Write an enzyme that holds these catalytic residues in place. Structure first.
Site, PDB file in Angstrom:
ATOM      1  N   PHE A   1       5.199   5.655   6.636  1.00 48.34           N
ATOM      2  CA  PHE A   1       3.938   5.227   7.227  1.00 48.34           C
ATOM      3  C   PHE A   1       3.503   3.958   6.508  1.00 48.34           C
ATOM      4  O   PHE A   1       3.312   3.976   5.298  1.00 48.34           O
ATOM      5  CB  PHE A   1       2.859   6.306   7.102  1.00 48.34           C
ATOM      6  CG  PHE A   1       3.016   7.454   8.070  1.00 48.34           C
ATOM      7  CD1 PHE A   1       3.959   8.456   7.846  1.00 48.34           C
ATOM      8  CD2 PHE A   1       2.197   7.552   9.187  1.00 48.34           C
ATOM      9  CE1 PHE A   1       4.100   9.515   8.726  1.00 48.34           C
ATOM     10  CE2 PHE A   1       2.328   8.622  10.079  1.00 48.34           C
ATOM     11  CZ  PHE A   1       3.287   9.601   9.851  1.00 48.34           C
TER      12      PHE A   1
ATOM     13  N   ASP B   1       7.082   0.061  -1.291  1.00 45.93           N
ATOM     14  CA  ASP B   1       5.718   0.150  -0.806  1.00 45.93           C
ATOM     15  C   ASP B   1       4.919   1.091  -1.719  1.00 45.93           C
ATOM     16  O   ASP B   1       5.017   2.311  -1.604  1.00 45.93           O
ATOM     17  CB  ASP B   1       5.702   0.627   0.647  1.00 45.93           C
ATOM     18  CG  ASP B   1       4.303   0.690   1.236  1.00 45.93           C
ATOM     19  OD1 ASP B   1       3.310   0.507   0.489  1.00 45.93           O
ATOM     20  OD2 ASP B   1       4.187   0.938   2.458  1.00 45.93           O
TER      21      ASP B   1
ATOM     22  N   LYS C   1      -4.947  -0.610  -0.977  1.00 46.84           N
ATOM     23  CA  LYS C   1      -5.850   0.567  -1.106  1.00 46.84           C
ATOM     24  C   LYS C   1      -6.685   0.544  -2.379  1.00 46.84           C
ATOM     25  O   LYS C   1      -7.770  -0.031  -2.372  1.00 46.84           O
ATOM     26  CB  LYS C   1      -5.052   1.859  -0.867  1.00 46.84           C
ATOM     27  CG  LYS C   1      -4.848   2.005   0.647  1.00 46.84           C
ATOM     28  CD  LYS C   1      -3.991   3.192   1.138  1.00 46.84           C
ATOM     29  CE  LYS C   1      -3.479   2.889   2.559  1.00 46.84           C
ATOM     30  NZ  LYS C   1      -2.784   4.017   3.227  1.00 46.84           N
TER      31      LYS C   1
HETATM   32  C1  LIG Z   1      -2.089   3.538   4.455  1.00 46.69           C
HETATM   33  C2  LIG Z   1      -0.858   2.840   4.031  1.00 46.69           C
HETATM   34  C3  LIG Z   1      -0.445   1.507   4.526  1.00 46.69           C
HETATM   35  C4  LIG Z   1      -1.322   0.767   5.506  1.00 46.69           C
HETATM   36  O1  LIG Z   1      -2.509   0.379   4.821  1.00 46.69           O
HETATM   37  P1  LIG Z   1      -3.808  -0.091   5.656  1.00 46.69           P
HETATM   38  O2  LIG Z   1      -4.401   1.085   6.388  1.00 46.69           O
HETATM   39  O3  LIG Z   1      -4.786  -0.689   4.669  1.00 46.69           O
HETATM   40  O4  LIG Z   1      -3.312  -1.132   6.652  1.00 46.69           O
HETATM   41  C5  LIG Z   1       0.736   0.939   4.047  1.00 46.69           C
HETATM   42  N1  LIG Z   1       1.554   1.565   3.173  1.00 46.69           N
HETATM   43  C6  LIG Z   1       1.280   2.798   2.666  1.00 46.69           C
HETATM   44  C7  LIG Z   1       2.207   3.470   1.677  1.00 46.69           C
HETATM   45  C8  LIG Z   1       0.049   3.502   3.075  1.00 46.69           C
HETATM   46  O5  LIG Z   1      -0.256   4.731   2.586  1.00 46.69           O
HETATM   47  C9  LIG Z   1      -1.637   4.732   5.305  1.00 46.69           C
HETATM   48  C10 LIG Z   1      -0.832   4.383   6.564  1.00 46.69           C
HETATM   49  C11 LIG Z   1      -1.037   5.578   7.507  1.00 46.69           C
HETATM   50  C12 LIG Z   1      -0.758   5.262   8.964  1.00 46.69           C
HETATM   51  O6  LIG Z   1       0.232   4.551   9.275  1.00 46.69           O
HETATM   52  O7  LIG Z   1      -1.507   5.761   9.834  1.00 46.69           O
HETATM   53  C13 LIG Z   1      -2.474   6.068   7.265  1.00 46.69           C
HETATM   54  C14 LIG Z   1      -2.749   5.540   5.881  1.00 46.69           C
HETATM   55  N2  LIG Z   1      -3.825   5.753   5.263  1.00 46.69           N
END
Ligand SMILES: *[C@@H](c1c(COP(=O)(O)O)cnc(C)c1O)[C@@H]1C[C@H](C(=O)O)CC1=N
Ligand SMILES: *[C@@H](c1c(COP(=O)(O)O)cnc(C)c1O)[C@@H]1C[C@H](C(=O)O)CC1=N
Ligand SMILES: *[C@@H](c1c(COP(=O)(O)O)cnc(C)c1O)[C@@H]1C[C@H](C(=O)O)CC1=N
Lengths: 404, 404, 404
Positions: C142, C228, C257
């Site tokens: 994700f 990531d 984050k």
């Molecule tokens: C958050 C998340 C992202 C994307 O970050 P953003 O929401 O600020 O754009 C990237 N990489 C990792 C490892 C993360 O945890 C996740 C993504 C997830 C989703 O795709 O719906 C929900 C999240 N809180």
């Protein structure tokens, strides 16, 4: 003196390749649902040789067909005609309602043939640029051990150390229609090959509607739907073909294993003329493919399934087996699944106690089953089993499981 | 009344794939060197089902072996042991003097197994980086019709429309030691696979010393020598293995076809522990591979070759056959070649007159043979043929050729 | 009067998009580990806003940084310089020991940036033909909800109905080195992007040695390793970066984050010059990326993590958390997993009992957590939590799980 079990183990260890991890038991006779080891002990067969002896070991009908033909003619090759192959071809194509059959010997040979058909049709009928044709497979698939077969595998034990791998093979998750729909956006995909139930992966049963969705998406996007029924077909799941449960017609159907009742390696590729005739004379074959001996055996093996209504029996008895297994404690057996008499349980493996140990003790209590991985045990007895015999088996399984 | 030859032709046309170009003759019985069609007419078999019935059709000793075991036990899979496989394993390994055998069913399965061994050895023993291992093949090779096998082919009929092809398969000319030496300069080469005589290429006999040279180059560069004796082995060329003529010991030997006398699809991969044991339990297999029915058949088939001294017979009678064939006019038969009873002639093909037409007339005169392309006719009768029978056949061949 | 929780729910239902499935609770205040709803009730935060408030809600030092800078200058764009960005760039690059940082706002933007870096590096340095470059992802990943991000997803909820999809994105299983090794045989692969622990997949922790194996395979095949760490970094797992547990140095590191303590959307892409400088002036940007207000916040947020040794605390307290959780009945909680303070439990979901219902009751008992599907609950409190507070929280979880 005659060899003991330990003698037999030792001899193979010395003169045979170590490519298997067998259950330590040494059989010398089989009949119907039963096997006997060299010590004379009797066992329920709950593997059925990977669902090849659906008809039971040494079925008299199939044996008699073999003995009758072996005196007349056993191998011409298809460089000549013989009097048997056409009779088998007409019988099996009418039974499953496809125009034509291409006869092979083993399951993986049927799968290779299907990939070649898919590619040939892809290039010469669909019009894909050479050589860009793709075949999509589902994660967890097993269809044999050729270099091409293991190229589509997601199990490292199958492919690790055996590359480089066959290009043009893509993988998506099993039981996942959105993933199939996404994959078939690529017009260079010629086929989707899939098992109606994944056997060696551990009897993984897809959700109701999956096969309908598969048939729908393949038709919509001009993709061949190849159904591998080499393990699931021929009454094992309670139908002539497991795809019959959703009344769907694949473009290509693969049969093997039980097609001979275990008496001869016979496999088959079924499809209509538009697909089958993309392969011209000289462009595919096999020395023993379509030989008159295997054909006499296969006709008899198919007739047994029909005459004895083994599909109905597997359907009836399968639900009893699953219902009884579901009574085992929720924390020794964590899942029960299957269709007809293709079934499995998952056991809560500890680092102290596991599927292998359960199967050893099952052996000790008179029932032969094999794990796949280390937490799944398959239960697949010959389809000739009777309800009282099944319930005796169930008692053995209860006894063993509850003994730990 | 019974179906005629034309009936039989038409039924297969309707219900069977069109992947063969057979000689128009329909057989229903075979015994020793003879076949009978459905009209009752009798023929000399000079194809021997591509050298699978070296022992003659329906040899009583192999037939009895099949009949005896089929009542006991026919298939356990190698998930369990039985009492037969180890007995066969000890026998065949000691016969050809290798540590171990890996049992499979068809010839192409044996080849695939050998490629997997070569690669696995390449990575785990020789230390090639995954997945950079190469296998070298000779142009003109034929070893079956899987995707991997046709990927090494130089015959368009075999590979066209079936790509993309297996990577890591390199091709060099046959009978070319300098070419082999250049190829083996690459340390990533794991193996060289080659036929001691190329069968389907049209009985192509390499020059004296080729095999000795291959052996030397492979040993020097730490490359596995894989000898495909699926067609040339088992007495067909006058020795146990064609490779025996120059005292050469390959690292891996492949056997198939006549290993069962035509009664059952049985093939074998022979090699020592250092290679064989690169494959660990679970890493390779086949449902019917090593089944007890095929094992009893193979043991009997091998014993027949020994007891009746068929290698000696093939040697002596082969000499006569080639000598008598060489009496044909240089005008008409431009080449005669072969070893033992694996032989061929090359005719000076005109636009009107070709190998197919000759074979059609040979059929009409009581002898069945198959051409390779427009100018090559293969002659390969069962090894139980007697001199008088052979000379009768030679007469038939003579009058047929001169009648054009 | 003032709006109730129900009022708040119904207002968003009317005027806001329905793209979320929120837990029915309406917060108005947050401080450290605690949150208060509009009715005055107090809760433990065990979501930490998907690990964006590692430093706890409204950390005074980060708040002070915000308040100080907002009176000075907030946004120039990077079309001009300001006095803050360079200071932040030096600070963060020396902290993680990479040459350079590229500043962006959200996590998915940092991910997009890394994909562009990998492709640009693939073409201009590795020498891949335009536009044949591939990026490999792990199933279960994700990283956001752009068209590109969901093109690499294996979750139908993320991609279904939103195609066609970005080409050149390939997927392999997580925690699977042989599959990675197979995938990197293609020289057109430019990068492998992967989470050290898969957060949204359900806190999936790979086997010991996975990260080392990835690093080694990427190096061996000249492929960029993109880590990531947007959820796993910044002390959450008990290290500055989760890859630090195996002393592994990725080629590209993604942060986000918690980089801002929840006060501002700030993300970062870290790598060395041979990668970073493949992007030339004008070739990538973002209006708010690298703005002075976010940079002051980020420096403060990073200082809090260090000055309060929050990674040390996360490691110590996570050990306690997982040990206590494993005391729950093995028949209701079937698994416990995590590192530091990123943890999850799996429950034995039935038809009438699920993760959602559990989280509803946790809420009622003063603890806020988010489920994953029907059988997973994540537990991730702010890293400023104290042992006594953790233990109190744990009893809420115990009370809640046992109450069913
Ligand atoms: C958050 C998340 C992202 C994307 O970050 P953003 O929401 O600020 O754009 C990237 N990489 C990792 C490892 C993360 O945890 C996740 C993504 C997830 C989703 O795709 O719906 C929900 C999240 N809180
Ligand atoms: C058998 C199997 C095959 C291959 O059949 P073969 O062993 O005669 O070549 C093809 N398709 C299906 C659905 C099968 O079940 C499986 C394959 C498995 C493996 O790959 O190891 C072991 C089997 N029994
Ligand atoms: C038979 C043959 C094989 C393949 O054996 P199979 O037909 O049982 O799978 C392997 N190696 C050698 C030397 C052989 O002669 C050949 C293959 C050929 C073809 O590729 O079409 C036709 C045959 N009879």
């Amino acid at each position: 003196g005659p060899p003991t079990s330990d003698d037999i183990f030792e001899r193979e260890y010395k003169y045979g390749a170590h490519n298997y991890h067998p259950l330590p038991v040494a059989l010398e006779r089989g009949k119907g649902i039963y096997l006997w080891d060299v010590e004379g002990r009797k066992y329920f067969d709950f593997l059925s040789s990977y669902s090849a002896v659906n008809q039971g070991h040494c079925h008299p009908k199939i044996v008699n067909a073999l003995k009758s033909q072996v005196d007349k003619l056993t191998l011409t090759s298809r460089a000549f005609y013989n009097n048997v192959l056409g009779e088998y071809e007409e019988y099996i194509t009418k039974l499953f309602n496809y125009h034509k059959v291409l006869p092979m010997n083993t399951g993986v040979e049927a799968g290779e043939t299907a990939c070649k058909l898919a590619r040939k049709w892809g290039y010469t009928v669909k019009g894909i640029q050479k050589y860009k044709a793709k075949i999509v497979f589902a994660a967890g698939n097993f269809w044999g051990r050729t270099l091409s077969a293991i190229s589509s595998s997601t199990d490292p034990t199958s492919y690790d150390g055996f590359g480089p791998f066959m290009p043009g093979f893509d993988i998506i998750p099993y039981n996942d229609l959105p993933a199939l729909e996404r994959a078939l956006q690529d017009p260079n995909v010629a086929a989707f090959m899939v098992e109606p139930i994944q056997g060696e992966a551990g009897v993984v049963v897809p959700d109701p509607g999956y096969l309908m969705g598969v048939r729908e998406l393949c038709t919509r996007h001009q993709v061949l739907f190849i159904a591998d029924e080499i393990q699931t077909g021929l009454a094992r799941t309670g139908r002539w073909l497991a795809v019959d449960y959703e009344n769907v017609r694949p473009d290509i159907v693969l049969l093997g294993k039980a097609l001979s009742g275990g008496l001869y390696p016979v496999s088959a590729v079924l499809c209509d003329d538009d697909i089958m005739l993309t392969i011209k004379p000289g462009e595919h074959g096999s020395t023993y493919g379509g030989n008159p001996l295997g054909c006499r055996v296969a006709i008899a093996a198919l007739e047994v399934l029909e005459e004895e209504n083994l599909a109905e029996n597997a359907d009836k008895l399968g639900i009893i087996l699953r219902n009884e297994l579901m009574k085992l404690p929720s924390d020794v057996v964590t899942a029960v699944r299957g269709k007809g008499l293709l079934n499995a349980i998952v056991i809560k493996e500890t680092k102290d106690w596991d599927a292998w140990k359960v199967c050893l003790r099952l052996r000790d209590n008179g029932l032969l089953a094999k794990p796949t991985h280390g937490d799944i045990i398959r239960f697949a007895p010959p389809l000739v089993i009777k309800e009282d015999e099944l319930r005796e088996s169930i008692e053995i399984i209860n006894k063993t499981i509850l003994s730990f």
